[PDB]
């Protein structure tokens, strides 16, 4: 807790530009408001002739629907002069310099005796507002034409704060007196006087409007458009009170900006409705109140970060919407009533206004948990995440922020076709409640989404995409037939963040069925109808249900949104997300009985080989060695729920088929003191296990395979039990005389062989010792992080399409992918598979190596990495980075409590492969922000390679191996000899491993190790890409230690022996090798 105020001063130094971008803006501001001073008065009229006054004139007049008729509006217009001051962000000096450009604020208040005391009937108060600004802007365009500034400024009718019932006039400049640099637009918004009425008609429950529904939008909008200066009056009172306020408002407003809550409005489908001035007036309320015993929660005698802490702790803890609120008055305490209004509420007595009624229940419901999450990530003293809490824009992409996104195409036709296209109601009470059809059906579609899902998702957000908040003078509103309607969108993004525990629960229960059936059960069977059902279970429990059909491609969340869309809001709408099905059938389908109708969170094949290992586990405990088994325990990918083609029985060509599993015996003192004798003694134990197993449990098949992964000990022989249930296991023996034997090898090795022997011991520690706690923490974390297993499955599919997986280890990819789960901040936990995968890609693009490590605490939410251990991993990361500054050999530093060293999983990977990973992730993120998620977008995201690689050796196996690998578009037995598995399996990965292991100084190779996860439908084609070292850019002369294959042409120079070396590759695999290409 020492760098935070330096971060405050640093972010302020980036944000202040407070003379050169603002003094000439004040100059043009002086010009504009003295122009509007010099605009004169205008007298009594009637709208039945102001229509002909605006008949063929260039100006137009905005309104709300319905358009005014002269019959019920025998109406009058007067034009007097307000005296202007400045308001808000500019007047409190909080200008933020976006590439987009913030707005500015202006004052057009209103006198008293030009309008009567009955502005509470059918919006003609805002009609005289509209005609007022219409004549003012026509005289402003005349003053444009006579003050010669026609060529560069532009006047624009607009919807103020995305509200169709408040129009404004914004000047924006288009290409001494012309200007384009700082934030652009100036507006022309109105004000009404302060005291207009009697005290009982400003509570938003009231009615006075035509055929008692409340009009909360109406009697909040007239109140907001009346009081735009009381807020600044007590705001400057609090400004005279506190010194913390400008720093408070600037850090709160860029907080709200980089998490996307703008102050437009939330009703018509926009993430936002909460903003900086609502934030500051509730800050001042919480400053001079906040307790039931009048506890002033904030004291205003100290700095800004603690007031930020206090105000977001308040608005995160204390609930405002569903049950009561604290209300405050100004002309000043605050106190809690417990009356929930089904609306985010905070109430006044000086203004008597409900300020957050511009903002929806769903937007408050998601913003409160944004605030709870930012409490969670700035109440932890261990890390430093100012970049997470104030720097990264989490709203800039449409799918890191939300788990699921669907289209809602609405080809409803026209406003008069709405009757028999829209399946909801369209009547007087609903359009006098919700002002426009856009926010009406947005509210209705959020209600039917929440009732269709309930606890099956966390939070909902709707947005009308393509919504436009400005319109030219040539048309009275927006009138553009976009996407199939005359309405202010083209289609609808429905967006979900999901409770991952109940994604694919195929029964959503209603109430229990009593005889006189309950009213919410009636609502349930009205909502479901043909799909609703009366129900009992295996415990004898009657309820109301509806069942679903789980599929690997389509999750049932899509079908339940499809049903609740094509029943209750339209019949001819279209709902789809083909991206979801695209990566869901990128994931390999196992050859299991009824495996197309399984889910994606289904771990049943993993449970099946776990049970077969339990049977082998029992029959290997119950036997007798001369030295009995201490612990047999599994360590493989199928046991930490990670293999791509999840294991079907009898699948030879799966390289994850043979599962790694480690047994250890007692701590016997009779181990031999030498490494090859120790390996042969361990295999003597394995030979006795094999002979007793083949003696008694004859239904298991067994052979021996020589391990070659640990370098320079050629005696490691592993056996291979082939279960009758259809699985294979690589049994190994761990002793207590191995790690101390390798450490004394480090000791008495030759002095220039210590890094090579430490590489050997790091491969040993990564394989036997640390892998056990690795698979423990991953198996124990997968059941709270339920999308982790499929996001690693197609993350390694992605990584094998791009064929880095022969170099980057599996466990390194597992740690890379568990980073956005154990630390999802500032984003949330991935509740969908695409969300997890592109959060992985976004992080590994965004993450820089040399300055920052990647620590990660593998713990479930709500054992954890403490401050001392965190500083220790920072210290040995600092030691690694100042022993090597630019990452020559140690290229990723990932570390946990299971590995404080960091070197373990990332050793032996080359710099072209590591930079290929980072560069390809940055290409992916750049392409996603270029085009967005589309079918061809995902398809070239998963296309293999086609970049600056230099060899393409093209390969086929004499038989396709997806039948015998378990990916279906049948193997069920083992042959009479256990050597036909050789020609049923592929050689390509270990052959290219020997190629790289011999050519390791001259060039690096690669291959796709899983041949038919990525190699076509037949499952046959694999590539081998070579890449010459940057050392071999010229033509060296022959030395003794340069490790190449040479073709000298002159006396001095040698060159790569290229043709003969890829011919020798072709001879080493010529039954497999069928084609060669240079780039």
């Amino acid at each position: 807790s020492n760098i935070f105020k330096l971060q405050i001063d640093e972010l302020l130094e980036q944000v202040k530009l407070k003379q050169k971008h603002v003094l000439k803006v004040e100059k043009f501001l002086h010009k504009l408001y003295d122009i509007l001073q010099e605009i004169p008065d205008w007298e009594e009229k009637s709208l039945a002739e102001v229509d002909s006054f605006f008949k063929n004139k260039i100006v137009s007049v905005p309104f709300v629907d319905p358009k005014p008729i002269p019959q019920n509006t025998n109406y009058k217009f007067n034009y007097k002069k307000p005296d202007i001051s400045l308001i808000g962000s500019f007047a409190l000096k909080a200008g933020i310099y976006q590439p987009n450009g913030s707005s500015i604020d202006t004052l057009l208040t209103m006198p008293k005796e030009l309008f009567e005391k009955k502005d509470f009937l059918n919006f003609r108060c805002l009609h005289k507002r509209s005609v007022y600004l219409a004549y003012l802007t026509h005289h402003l365009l005349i003053l444009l034409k006579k003050d010669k500034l026609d060529s560069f400024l532009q006047l624009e009718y607009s919807y103020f704060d995305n509200d169709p019932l408040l129009p404004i006039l914004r000047i924006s400049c288009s290409k001494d007196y012309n200007f384009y640099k700082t934030r652009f637009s100036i507006n022309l918004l109105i004000g009404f006087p302060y005291k207009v009425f009697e005290p009982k008609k400003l509570l938003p429950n009231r009615n006075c409007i035509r055929i008692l529904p409340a009009t909360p939008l109406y009697n909040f909008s007239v109140l907001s458009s009346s009081t735009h200066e009381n807020y600044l009056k007590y705001l400057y009172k609090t400004k005279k009170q506190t010194e913390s306020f400008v720093e408070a408002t600037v850090l709160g407003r860029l907080w709200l900006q980089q998490r996307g809550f703008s102050s437009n409005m939330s009703h018509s489908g926009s993430l936002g409705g909460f903003g900086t001035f609502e934030f500051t007036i509730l800050m001042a309320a919480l400053l001079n109140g906040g307790g039931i015993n009048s506890n002033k929660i904030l004291l205003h005698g100290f700095s800004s970060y603690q007031l930020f802490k206090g105000v977001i702790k308040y608005l995160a803890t204390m609930d405002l919407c569903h049950d009561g609120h604290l209300q405050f008055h100004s002309n000043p305490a605050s106190k809690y009533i417990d009356e929930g209004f089904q609306t985010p509420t905070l109430f006044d007595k000086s203004t008597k206004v409900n300020i957050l009624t511009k903002m929806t229940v769903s937007s408050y419901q998601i913003l409160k948990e944004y605030a709870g999450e930012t409490l969670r990530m700035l109440n932890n003293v261990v890390q430093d995440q100012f970049s997470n809490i104030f720097l990264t824009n989490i709203s800039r992409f449409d799918n890191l922020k939300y788990d699921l996104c669907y289209d809602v195409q609405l080809p409803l036709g026209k406003y008069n076709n709405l009757e028999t296209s829209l399946a909801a109601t369209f009547g007087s009470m609903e359009r006098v409640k919700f002002i426009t059809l856009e926010n009406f059906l947005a509210h209705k579609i959020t209600n039917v989404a929440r009732y269709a899902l309930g606890d099956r998702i966390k939070y909902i957000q709707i947005e009308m995409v393509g919504q436009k908040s400005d319109f030219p003078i040539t048309k009275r509103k927006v009138y553009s037939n976009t996407g199939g309607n005359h309405f202010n969108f083209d289609f609808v993004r429905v967006k979900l963040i999901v409770n991952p525990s109940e994604c694919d629960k195929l029964v959503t229960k209603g109430p229990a069925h009593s005889e006189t059936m309950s009213t919410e059960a009636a609502v349930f069977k009205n909502f479901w109808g043909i799909k609703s059902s009366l129900r009992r279970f295996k415990d004898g429990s009657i309820t109301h249900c509806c069942v679903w059909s789980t599929s690997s491609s389509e999750p049932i969340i899509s079908s339940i949104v499809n049903f609740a869309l094509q029943k209750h809001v339209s019949k001819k709408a279209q709902i789809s997300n083909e991206t979801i099905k695209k990566f869901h059938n990128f994931l390999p389908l196992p050859n299991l009985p009824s495996s197309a109708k399984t889910s994606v969170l289904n771990l049943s094949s993993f449970f099946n080989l776990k049970k077969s290992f339990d049977d082998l586990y029992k029959i290997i405990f119950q036997m007798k060695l001369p030295l009995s088994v201490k612990s047999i325990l599994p360590v493989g990918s199928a046991f930490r729920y990670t293999s791509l083609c999840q294991p079907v029985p009898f699948a030879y060509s799966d390289p994850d088929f043979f599962q790694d599993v480690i047994l250890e015996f007692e701590t016997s003192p009779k181990w031999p003191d030498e490494i090859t004798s120790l390996e042969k003694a361990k295999t003597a134990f394995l030979l006795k296990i094999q002979e007793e197993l083949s003696a008694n449990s004859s239904t298991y098949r067994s052979f021996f395979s020589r391990d070659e992964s640990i370098p320079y000990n050629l005696e490691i022989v592993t056996l291979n039990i082939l279960t009758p249930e259809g699985y294979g296991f690589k049994f190994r023996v761990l002793t207590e005389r191995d790690e101390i034997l390798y450490l004394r090898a480090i000791a008495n090795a030759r002095n220039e062989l210590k890094p090579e022997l430490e590489a050997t011991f790091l491969k040993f520690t990564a394989k036997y010792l640390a892998s056990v706690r690795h698979t423990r923490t991953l198996e124990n974390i997968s059941h709270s992080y339920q999308f982790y297993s499929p996001v690693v499955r197609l993350f390694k599919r992605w990584l094998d399409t791009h064929l880095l997986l022969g170099h980057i280890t599996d466990e390194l990819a597992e740690l890379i992918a568990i980073k956005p789960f154990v630390d999802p901040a500032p984003y949330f936990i991935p509740g969908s598979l695409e969300n997890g995968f592109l959060k992985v890609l976004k992080f590994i693009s965004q993450w820089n190596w040399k300055d920052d490590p990647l620590i990660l605490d593998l713990v479930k939410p709500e054992e954890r990495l403490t401050l001392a251990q965190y500083k220790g991993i920072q210290m040995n990361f600092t030691n690694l980075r100042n022993s090597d500054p630019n990452g020559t050999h140690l290229q990723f530093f990932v570390a946990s409590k299971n590995d404080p060293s960091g070197i373990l999983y990332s050793s032996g990977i080359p710099l072209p492969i590591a930079t290929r990973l980072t560069a390809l992730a940055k290409v992916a993120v750049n392409l996603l922000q270029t085009h967005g998620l589309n079918q061809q977008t995902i398809n070239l995201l998963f296309t293999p390679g086609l970049k600056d690689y230099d060899f393409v050796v093209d390969l086929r196996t004499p038989i396709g191996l997806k039948s015998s690998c378990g990916i279906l578009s049948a193997p069920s037995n083992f042959p009479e000899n256990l050597n036909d598995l050789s020609e049923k399996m592929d050689p390509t990965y270990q052959l290219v491993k020997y190629l790289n292991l011999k050519y390791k100084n001259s060039l690096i190779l690669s291959s796709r190790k899983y041949i038919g996860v990525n190699g076509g439908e037949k499952g046959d084609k694999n590539v081998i890409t070579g890449l010459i070292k940057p050392l071999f850019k010229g033509a060296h002369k022959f030395r003794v230690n340069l490790d190449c294959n040479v073709k000298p042409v002159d006396d001095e120079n040698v060159i790569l022996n290229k043709e003969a070396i890829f011919h020798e590759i072709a001879a080493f695999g010529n039954d497999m090798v069928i084609n060669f290409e240079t780039d």
Partner: protein, 174 residues
């Protein structure tokens, strides 16, 4: 250009062919050779051999020797090959590095002789082959690939045979 057939310090280029590939439209491999002696056992009277193919075992280096003997009647006592760490499996000896006994450069090979007549005969003979292949590379004696690679090395998925590793473990423990 091929007529350069003598390097800076004693090196000899020995070229030979590569056989047919199904997707290649004169694939040529070189060896480098010097020679050296010492007072020790097998590092005496020995030629260096650089840029040797994949897993060059005994018997096809021996058919190379045998076609030289059946061609020019050279004196040649070579029937074992020394110090071919082909892929990189024997840089250290971890057994003697953590053991009581068994004690006592990159991509090079170490081909001994026993006779001064044999080393001078093979030296000037292969120098004459280097010169004649330098001015005409056409129909030299070549690489008879009666495949050693697919038999003597395809063991990666072949299981280790039971009685063989039983006898190995038994004699080593004994």
């Amino acid at each position: 250009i091929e007529d350069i057939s003598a390097m800076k310090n004693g090196f000899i280029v020995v070229p030979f062919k590569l056989p047919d590939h199904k997707a290649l439209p004169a694939s040529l491999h070189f060896m480098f050779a010097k020679r050296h002696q010492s007072s020790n056992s097998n590092e005496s009277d020995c030629l260096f051999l650089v840029n040797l193919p994949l897993l060059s075992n005994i018997e096809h280096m021996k058919k190379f020797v045998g076609q030289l003997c059946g061609k020019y009647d050279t004196v040649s006592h070579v029937e074992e090959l020394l110090y071919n760490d082909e892929f990189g499996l024997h840089e250290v000896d971890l057994s003697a590095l953590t053991s009581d006994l068994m004690s006592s450069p990159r991509n090079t090979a170490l081909l001994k002789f026993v006779d001064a007549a044999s080393i001078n005969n093979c030296w000037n003979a292969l120098k004459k082959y280097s010169n004649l292949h330098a001015k005409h590379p056409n129909e030299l004696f070549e690489w008879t690939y009666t495949t050693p690679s697919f038999t003597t090395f395809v063991n990666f998925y072949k299981p280790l045979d039971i009685d063989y590793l039983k006898e190995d473990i038994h004699t080593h423990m004994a």
